[PDB]
Paper text:
In sequence analysis, enzyme [name] was found to be a member of the HSL family. [name] exhibits two different activities for the catalytic metabolism of chloramphenicol (Cm), a widely used, broad-spectrum antibiotic; it acts as both a Cm acetate [name] (CAE) and a Cm hydrolase. [name] cleaves the amide linkage at C2 of Cm and thereby confers Cm resistance to bacteria heterologously expressing the [name] gene. Structural analyses in this study have validated that [name] contains structural features characteristic of the HSL family, with an α/β hydrolase fold and a CAP domain.
A crystal of [name](ΔPMP) contains two monomers per asymmetric unit. Monomeric [name](ΔPMP) consists of an N-terminal CAP domain and an α/β hydrolase domain. In addition to the core α/β fold, the 40-residue segment at the N-terminus forms a helix-loop-helix arrangement known as a CAP domain, in which α1 is almost orthogonal to α2 and protrudes from the main α/β fold. The putative catalytic triad, Asp252-His282-Ser156, is located at the C-terminal end of the central β-strands. [name] has a relatively shallow, pocket-shaped active site, consistent with its substrate preference for p-nitrophenyl acetate over p-nitrophenyl butyrate. Residues Trp86, Met211, and Trp215 are clustered at the bottom of the active site in [name](ΔPMP) and possibly occlude the active site pocket. Two monomers in an asymmetric unit show a non-crystallographic, two-fold symmetry. Interestingly, the CAP domains of the two monomers are in a domain-swap configuration in which the N-terminal helix α1 of the CAP domain almost intercalates into the potential vacancy between α1* and the main α/β fold of the adjacent monomer. As a result, the N-terminal helices α1 and α1* are packed in an anti-parallel orientation in the dimer. Under these structural conditions, it is unlikely that the dimer observed in crystalline [name](ΔPMP) represents a biologically relevant oligomeric conformation, but its structural features could still provide details on the monomeric enzyme with the active site residues.
Residue numbers in the entry:
A (entry chain A): 2 to 309
B (entry chain B): 2 to 315
Write the structure that this text describes.
């Protein structure tokens, strides 16, 4: 009989929005197959090696179709709980954001815990931002129209970099796109009870494991750029987008970070996506509804990164 | 409520590894997570342009992590019924084959029908192989360890290229990897009746459409490099792998071509994958069972493209 996984895939393909073409000519069929089979289309993808003091980081530059000659740049940090994830796991996510925002995206492969515990991953993310600013002309982008972004632990890193950039008089940032970010290590929140059992992909036990490897023996109170929620003064940070997911155990701490930013006078667009789980920005192929939220974040980037 | 598409994805996820957070084993959870819902990692990927007589083709070179300093090369032709498909639709498949074979892969964006009818796409694929051999040093590969492969109409084109290389004293080939290939336009074979209804991704009417665009006015009997099942003498062709799929309408013509290759004295690994549909090599993210077959084909490639002897005591 039919392979059960093949059956599930055919069923899933069946529940997807019909492509709506009137006739089967080559252009139509090409378009349908491209939509099914290829990652989101961009004009150019370049694998870049970033040579920093003491370490090289892999990076990937995405330039979308229809882009300016010198487009704005979002430096992007992948999720994976500071321990897993690669340029390849988040390639589709970066293509999608570049395509919808019209901005270039530079995805950074920062060093991972436990091999490189706190504060190494955040310093990598920050130094990559600085590198991008100082090598903007080489990249072909506008270094004066700069954003950071990331999902999950990557959103944690983006938030920390926004704070580092303020604190260190680093490169000016026009936006921080925080996609269901990790912001704290209080596992007693309602979100963790409701959503952290394992039934929505990310679990509370997962997050304990991630936090453990990231921090090692460093107590969370002595790792101020880890639990960014606990930072007292969030004033003067880049305008933010904070998108949380209804069925994410991280939902409550993400909402809380958005409230604390807005309280500190930072312009924030914050929303919890109904019906969604942790990771849904990367699930747009199986979950067409994800595109609405990718477009929302992208449209905020596009607005805040426009030429003055 | 929980998004219905999300719920379906979660059910799909509920049939695969459950992470063990009682074991601090980063390199394990890594190898698992990083390889689910993500194209396989390779060391180098480069977009290149191939300049042939009268046209330029886009191509993409994949060099896997543990390839030789001067790796063997498979020239790969994407499927799509000679009408559709791109380097991007088949990028995941090429990455998987490079990773599991240890060989470089050069994916070719040949010209498509009906704009370019038979035999132009096949000539593009053959001329790209000739180009790769001629420019092996430029690619950084071993021009004396060459293979071809492809899926569906791409496997068709790979088979045609193998025949053309033999006939024209073209580059020597060590293998042809034929993944559920098109080999004939006989829509009366049993697998069309069984599998071609449309419920298994590829339909009989779909194949009639593809064949129509590829041949145009040319009768199939005058297109032997399309209907390769009608080639009389298959002896002396590159050693082959022919993987077919149980629920593919192309199953029986693929089996038939494998049988003819074997009868002509060509070494052939041929098998029909139980439970699978047309296209399943590209479906490895949702169908992890695909990997068994991807590994088998890639392993046959590795065997026949094997490196020469080198002593290690220096």
């Amino acid at each position: 009989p039919l392979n059960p996984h093949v059956e599930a895939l055919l069923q899933m393909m069946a529940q997807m929005p019909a492509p709506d073409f009137s006739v089967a000519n080559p252009a139509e069929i090409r378009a349908v197959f491209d939509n099914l089979a290829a990652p989101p289309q961009v004009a150019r993808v370049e694998n870049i090696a970033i040579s920093l003091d003491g370490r090289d980081l892999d990076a990937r530059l995405y330039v979308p179709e229809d882009a300016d000659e010198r487009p704005a740049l979002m430096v992007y940090y992948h999720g994976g709980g500071w321990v897993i994830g690669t340029l390849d796991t988040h390639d589709g996510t970066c293509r999608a954001l570049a395509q919808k925002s019209g901005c270039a995206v530079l995805s950074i492969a920062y060093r991972l815990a436990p091999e490189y515990r706190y504060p190494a991953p955040a310093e990598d993310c920050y130094d990559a931002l600085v590198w991008a600013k100082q090598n903007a002309a080489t990249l072909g982008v506008d270094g004066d129209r700069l954003a950071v972004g990331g999902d999950s632990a990557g959103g944690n890193l983006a938030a920390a970099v926004a704070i580092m950039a303020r604190d260190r008089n680093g490169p000016a940032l026009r936006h921080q796109l925080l996609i269901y970010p990790v912001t704290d290590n209080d596992f007693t929140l309602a979100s963790y009870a409701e959503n952290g059992g394992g039934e929505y992909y990310l679990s509370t036990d997962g997050m304990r494991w991630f936090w453990g490897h990231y921090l090692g023996d460093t107590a969370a109170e002595n790792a101020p750029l880890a639990a960014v929620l606990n930072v007292a003064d969030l004033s003067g940070l880049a305008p933010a987008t904070v998108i949380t997911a209804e069925y994410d155990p991280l939902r409550d701490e993400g909402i809380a970070y958005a409230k604390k930013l807005d309280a500190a006078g930072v312009p924030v667009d914050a929303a919890t996506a109904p019906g969604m789980i942790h990771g849904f920005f990367s699930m747009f192929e199986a979950v067409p509804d994800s595109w609405e939220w990718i477009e929302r974040g992208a449209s905020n980037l596009k607005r805040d990164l426009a030429l003055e």
